[PDB]
Design a binder for these strands. Structure first.
Ligand SMILES: [Mg+2]
Ligand SMILES: [Mg+2]
Ligand SMILES: [Mg+2]
Ligand SMILES: [Mg+2]
Ligand SMILES: [Mg+2]
Ligand SMILES: [Mg+2]
Ligand SMILES: [Mg+2]
Ligand SMILES: [Mg+2]
Ligand SMILES: [Mg+2]
Ligand SMILES: [Mg+2]
Ligand SMILES: [Mg+2]
Ligand SMILES: [Mg+2]
Ligand SMILES: [Mg+2]
Ligand SMILES: [Mg+2]
Ligand SMILES: [Mg+2]
Ligand SMILES: [Mg+2]
Ligand SMILES: [Mg+2]
Ligand SMILES: [Mg+2]
Ligand SMILES: [Mg+2]
Ligand SMILES: [Mg+2]
Ligand SMILES: [Mg+2]
Ligand SMILES: [Mg+2]
Ligand SMILES: [Mg+2]
Ligand SMILES: [Mg+2]
Ligand SMILES: [Mg+2]
Ligand SMILES: [Mg+2]
Ligand SMILES: [Mg+2]
Ligand SMILES: [Mg+2]
Ligand SMILES: [Mg+2]
Ligand SMILES: [Mg+2]
Ligand SMILES: [Mg+2]
Ligand SMILES: [Mg+2]
Ligand SMILES: [Mg+2]
Ligand SMILES: [Mg+2]
Ligand SMILES: [Mg+2]
Ligand SMILES: [Mg+2]
Ligand SMILES: [Mg+2]
Ligand SMILES: [Mg+2]
Ligand SMILES: [Mg+2]
Ligand SMILES: [Mg+2]
Ligand SMILES: [Mg+2]
Ligand SMILES: [Mg+2]
Ligand SMILES: [Mg+2]
Ligand SMILES: [Mg+2]
Ligand SMILES: [Mg+2]
Ligand SMILES: [Mg+2]
Ligand SMILES: [Mg+2]
Ligand SMILES: [Mg+2]
Ligand SMILES: [Mg+2]
Ligand SMILES: [Mg+2]
Ligand SMILES: [Mg+2]
Ligand SMILES: [Mg+2]
Ligand SMILES: [Mg+2]
Ligand SMILES: [Mg+2]
Ligand SMILES: [Mg+2]
Ligand SMILES: [Mg+2]
Ligand SMILES: [Mg+2]
Ligand SMILES: [Mg+2]
Ligand SMILES: [Mg+2]
Lengths: 209, 120, 122, 56, 114
RNA sequence: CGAUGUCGGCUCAUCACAUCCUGGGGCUGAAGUAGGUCCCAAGGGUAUGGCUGUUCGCCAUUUAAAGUGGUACGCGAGCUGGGUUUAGAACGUCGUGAGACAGUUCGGUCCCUAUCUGCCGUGGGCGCUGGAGAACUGAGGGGGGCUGCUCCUAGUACGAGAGGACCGGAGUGGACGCAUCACUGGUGUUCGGGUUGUCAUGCCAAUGGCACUGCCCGGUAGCUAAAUGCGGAAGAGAUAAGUGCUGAAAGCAUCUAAGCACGAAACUUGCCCCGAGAUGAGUUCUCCCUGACCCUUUAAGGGUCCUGAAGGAACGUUGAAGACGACGACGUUGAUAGGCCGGGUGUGUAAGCGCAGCGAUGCGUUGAGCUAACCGGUACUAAUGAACCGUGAGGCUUAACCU
RNA sequence: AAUUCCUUGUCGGGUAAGUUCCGACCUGCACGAAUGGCGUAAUGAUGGCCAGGCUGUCUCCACCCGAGACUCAGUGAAAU
RNA sequence: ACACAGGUGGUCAGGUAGAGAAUACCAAGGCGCUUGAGAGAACUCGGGUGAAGGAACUAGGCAAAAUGGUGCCGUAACUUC
RNA sequence: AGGACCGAACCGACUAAUGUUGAAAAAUUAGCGGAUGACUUGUGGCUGGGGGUGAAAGGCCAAUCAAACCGGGAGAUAGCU
């Protein structure tokens, strides 16, 4: 359902009156402006496209400026799309704010995780290292065996090997929301979220709930 | 992995790197212009400009610190007497780098690095 | 923390002094146990008079550890050694009638209220 | 590990298809000296962006 | 990090006495209970301090009943309630971790005269 | 037999179901709890040690359970080398002897830079029919799916008692997986300090080099687990074993022949990720180009001049992006990197001077000095006027309209 | 038992659990007196077993410092 | 076979610390080892540190870690004294 | 005094790793044994192949030893590939 796009400011803690420390992640959720509304006639689906501002003018190409000229007249870092469920809320130039999350108790939070680049075995798939002494010859972090024998005569698909790790979108699936403060574009959620500081993320009410 | 780290190894150990940067800083202070590789100059900036900032203020303790970090009375004296007042009112950016092609022996990118005032 | 082959001091007047952990009870593949967790031990020192002797195999509960406990306050409580109170193999009740050294709030549960009462501090 | 069959000149050329060099195709000129030079690099004479480097 | 800084000031406390490593402090910790909330005393030598604004902490070693019993307090927490200094030791060090193996009469710290 | 390396272990697995646990049922010589046997079910899960070279086995001690098999008795161009088929030596035994034992005993070289298939990642080219910048749909594929204990129902149903539920709710754990450094910690040869030997800066003082970073004590950022957040689901559809309603053949009966209803961790979906090379190459929005002329074998023809758009590429400053490509930000109409300013953090009272003391040393100036990767600012330095690529309205036939 | 197939013989000790080890039993398959028998202080880069300390051997790996691996320039192999 | 981390007899031999011709830093003297420049990925090699546990590893404490000097005190069974 | 003790030069080669188209047709690094004696080493000499030498391993006799190397009988023979 309708969600918002925010930036990861960092992590901190909140102390409650009952002596409990809650670790929270600060998400800056500025105003999101609707730039386009998809419907079932022109497109085959009902959704809305939104943007968050703070983009310079000389870096906006003519196609993007023309796209924004549709009652948005304000460029943003990028465009995101949210599938629109029932309700049929006002769409064009509505400028949804963080107040939308003033009643929800759970959020999913999607973002691009930190990029390791190398992964490597052991670190990527929690493989067990072979021994370090007792003769081991140049085989400590190596994977080991990758196939049975002549009978299969090959290596199966999906075999766990060394490659790229991180730098891919991940969801956290129903985090808890602690505080939603207005006049500051802030949303505090318990726990950690994927990505580094200053990275963009998509906050969306939990579907499991 | 390297995340938010600074300083490059130059394929050397710490002691060799420190000695090389000390010698290069002394040479740059003495000659006001030198020919070196681009990464080496980019690293030498962070070693040489702080010395000029330290020399901005003259005191016995600052002289001792500069001598600890350079180990050459000649260039220490050139500081606090010539390079101090020459900049004085300039806030950072005492050196500039200019690419100057490649080196014949190994095709390494080369660059001049020199003080901005250029002895004028 | 507290795993198999770990040597623990004794914090009650059972006359054992030193014990060795031989199993971490509760769940399969469980690695180590913290404070307030039942473990299987074997006696090693067994002072003469005592109430038990060397080679006995019975239960025990960890009351002090060098790693400590965090709990929601965010604080930590570390100790200089690992200690436990011997328990009956079947009834799971303490054998000794005295408790030495401080204990920690995680022993507040119903099962160890006698240990809580007998402890000198906390 | 060594080859079991001798690969062909066709495979050799297919592999080398990615070995072609690339030209700079970008030689900027200095409005003073007039010399063509590699961009962001000083000129062979000693000029850069009009000014004469290697001088007082 | 203006946002984070301004968020932390809202919880930072204004009644933290200036205590140094090697000083003996007395911390009154709240003991939560159904309807028996009350203070509890903890006295010991301060062996380490960590200054991180709202994330500040300090370690106190009590050495009770023959065991060291260390305790790490979060300075800006509602459970610490209050803290007071009873002695002023001279140690010319930031971390007193050697007291872990020192113990005995060698664990005493000379008072700081002023 | 012009060589297919053999037992056990380690690492990594994948399939079957004749099912060990979990799930659904019939029967019971099933009162309850707990059991026995059979049927359906392969989604997930399925122990650490002692002894032995030991797979197996016995033992101790856990678990819901510690399944049976195939895969060259899976796996040595992945590892080991304990057993076992070389050369040394000894015991028992056999032989006159050289020697032998499928008897024992001590010791005893494990090579290979990956061409092709395969697999894990990441790119270039062309295509998708004018070109370009974005957001999508989703054919298809992959990941995930485990389970204990405590409490309520309830000391209730059941039972003489002891004992003790099904169904339905709540909480807290084990193992596993994903993410992240707010906390607790590790590291932190780029920060501070102590100290031994020796050399040097003319000497004192103060510093630097070397000795594993000389040794050692702390410790920023980053990365990290032991640290802390989350997950497995609910729901829906069609079913397996099984249970049925109505109902003839066969006046009764019958779950079945016509018809109708329930029914499991299996199947489809729901959850997460990839995904239009999906050549079946999809959809939506936006942006750019609308000048002449010559020739021929005269049709998706060739050529001269003028023109060069949208955008891209290249170059430079770089990144919590990265083997290289790639990807992201910035290029003076600028905070992209370095420097500088302020702060923070760490270390722990710098040097010089003064006083006390014969001196080591202590006290004041002084929580001083220094301080990497951090935070907030600042054009001081470096990111150039340009050049390069990419064009000039985009085929044919038919269908519905304007002519 | 450097000797014993049956065999991990039986008993005792050690461990929590000991086909190994130590002490006995004697049913010596198949010990035995210069192809020497039984002991023996000291000695051993000798074989077996146990304990203290110590530890990344391990539960379970994490970070860091250098040399390669990777990219650019020069030279330039090999088995098959 | 090489401008090859191998082998090759004799003589001289300074300072500080040190028992020392060991070891560390130096003097006289001689050298930086005939491809470089970048980056800071798996994996390999050579090293440093490590929370709690401390042989649970393994055929086997293999390898690592640990002990380590001078003076004085003190020191068991057994013994060929 | 000692085929005495610890430990450099010197002589060895017990463990591990690396290397295995090597830096090297047995070496490098870290440990390890002897180190006044049955010790080690330079120069020269003697023992010659069914022979020599051997604190004995069928070991060594010019990177070759259950019978060295060079030349010859010799185009040995090969019911075998
Ligand atoms: Mg990265
Ligand atoms: Mg393992
Ligand atoms: Mg090897
Ligand atoms: Mg940086
Ligand atoms: Mg190099
Ligand atoms: Mg050094
Ligand atoms: Mg073939
Ligand atoms: Mg063949
Ligand atoms: Mg079946
Ligand atoms: Mg399913
Ligand atoms: Mg096999
Ligand atoms: Mg198998
Ligand atoms: Mg294989
Ligand atoms: Mg094998
Ligand atoms: Mg063997
Ligand atoms: Mg699947
Ligand atoms: Mg941090
Ligand atoms: Mg720390
Ligand atoms: Mg330092
Ligand atoms: Mg001095
Ligand atoms: Mg020197
Ligand atoms: Mg030296
Ligand atoms: Mg369901
Ligand atoms: Mg009928
Ligand atoms: Mg800047
Ligand atoms: Mg401070
Ligand atoms: Mg100082
Ligand atoms: Mg036997
Ligand atoms: Mg044992
Ligand atoms: Mg015996
Ligand atoms: Mg005999
Ligand atoms: Mg006789
Ligand atoms: Mg290479
Ligand atoms: Mg090359
Ligand atoms: Mg060839
Ligand atoms: Mg050479
Ligand atoms: Mg040589
Ligand atoms: Mg010699
Ligand atoms: Mg490295
Ligand atoms: Mg290593
Ligand atoms: Mg170490
Ligand atoms: Mg350190
Ligand atoms: Mg440790
Ligand atoms: Mg420790
Ligand atoms: Mg220990
Ligand atoms: Mg084992
Ligand atoms: Mg060893
Ligand atoms: Mg060692
Ligand atoms: Mg001797
Ligand atoms: Mg000796
Ligand atoms: Mg040998
Ligand atoms: Mg050696
Ligand atoms: Mg000796
Ligand atoms: Mg023989
Ligand atoms: Mg020979
Ligand atoms: Mg013959
Ligand atoms: Mg003849
Ligand atoms: Mg012939
Ligand atoms: Mg024949």
């Amino acid at each position: 359902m309708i969600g918002l796009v925010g930036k990861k400011v960092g992590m901190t803690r909140i102390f409650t009156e009952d002596g409990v420390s809650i670790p929270v992640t600060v998400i800056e959720v500025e105003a999101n402006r609707v730039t386009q509304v998809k419907d079932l006639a022109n497109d085959g689906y009902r959704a809305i496209q939104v943007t968050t501002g703070a983009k310079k003018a000389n870096r906006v190409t003519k196609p993007e400026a023309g796209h924004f000229a549709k009652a948005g007249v304000e460029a943003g870092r990028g465009l995101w799309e949210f599938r629109l469920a029932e309700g049929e809320e006002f769409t064009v130039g509505q400028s949804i704010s963080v107040e939308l999350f003033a009643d929800v108790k759970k959020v999913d939070v999607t973002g691009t995780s930190k990029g390791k680049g190398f992964a490597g075995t052991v670190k990527r798939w929690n493989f067990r290292t072979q021994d370090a002494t007792h003769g081991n010859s140049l085989s400590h972090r190596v994977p080991g065996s990758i196939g049975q024998n002549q009978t299969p005569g090959k290596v199966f698909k999906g075999k766990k090997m060394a490659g790229q790790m991180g730098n891919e979108r991940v969801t956290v699936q129903s985090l808890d929301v602690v505080r939603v403060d207005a006049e500051r574009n802030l949303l505090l959620v318990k726990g950690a979220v994927p990505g580094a500081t200053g990275s963009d993320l998509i906050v969306k009410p939990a579907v499991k709930a | 992995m390297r995340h938010r780290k600074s300083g490059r190894q130059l394929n050397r150990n710490s002691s060799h790197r420190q000695a090389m940067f000390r010698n290069m800083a002394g040479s740059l202070v003495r000659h006001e212009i030198i020919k070196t590789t681009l990464p080496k100059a980019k690293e030498l900036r962070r070693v040489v400009e702080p010395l000029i900032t330290l020399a901005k203020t003259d005191s016995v303790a600052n002289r001792r610190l500069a001598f600890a970090r350079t180990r050459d009375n000649e260039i220490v004296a050139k500081l606090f007497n010539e390079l101090g007042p020459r900049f004085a009112s300039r806030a950072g950016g005492y050196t500039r780098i200019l690419k100057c092609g490649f080196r014949a022996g190994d095709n390494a990118p080369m660059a001049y690095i020199e003080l901005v005032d250029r002895s004028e | 923390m507290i795993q198999e082959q770990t040597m623990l001091n004794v914090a009650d007047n059972s006359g054992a002094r030193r014990v060795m952990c031989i199993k971490v009870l509760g769940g399969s593949h469980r690695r180590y146990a913290g404070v307030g967790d039942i473990i299987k031990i074997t006696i090693k020192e067994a002072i003469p008079r005592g109430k038990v002797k060397k080679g006995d195999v019975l239960k025990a509960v960890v009351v002090r550890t060098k790693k400590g406990v965090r709990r929601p306050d965010g604080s930590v409580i570390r100790f200089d050694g690992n200690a436990c109170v011997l328990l009956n193999n079947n009834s799971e009740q303490p054998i000794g009638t005295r408790i030495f050294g401080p204990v920690t709030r995680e022993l507040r549960s119903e099962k160890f209220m006698k240990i809580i009462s007998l402890a000198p501090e906390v | 590990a060594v080859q079991q069959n001798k690969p062909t000149r066709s495979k050799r050329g297919m592999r080398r298809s990615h070995d072609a060099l690339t030209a700079v195709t970008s030689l900027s000129v200095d409005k003073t000296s007039g010399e063509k030079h590699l961009r962001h690099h000083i000129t062979a004479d000693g000029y850069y962006r009009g000014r004469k480097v290697i001088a007082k | 990090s203006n946002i984070i800084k301004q968020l932390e000031q809202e919880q930072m406390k204004q009644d933290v006495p200036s205590f140094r490593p090697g000083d003996t402090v007395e911390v009154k910790v709240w003991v939560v209970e159904g309807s028996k909330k009350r203070l509890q005393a903890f006295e010991g030598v301060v062996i380490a301090i960590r200054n991180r604004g709202l994330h500040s902490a300090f370690t106190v070693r009590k050495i009770s009943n023959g065991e060291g019993v260390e305790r790490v307090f979060q300075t800006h927490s509602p459970v610490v309630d209050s803290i007071s200094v009873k002695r002023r030791g001279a140690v010319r060090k930031a971390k007193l971790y050697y007291l872990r193996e020192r113990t005995g009469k060698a664990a005493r710290i000379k008072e700081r005269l002023n």
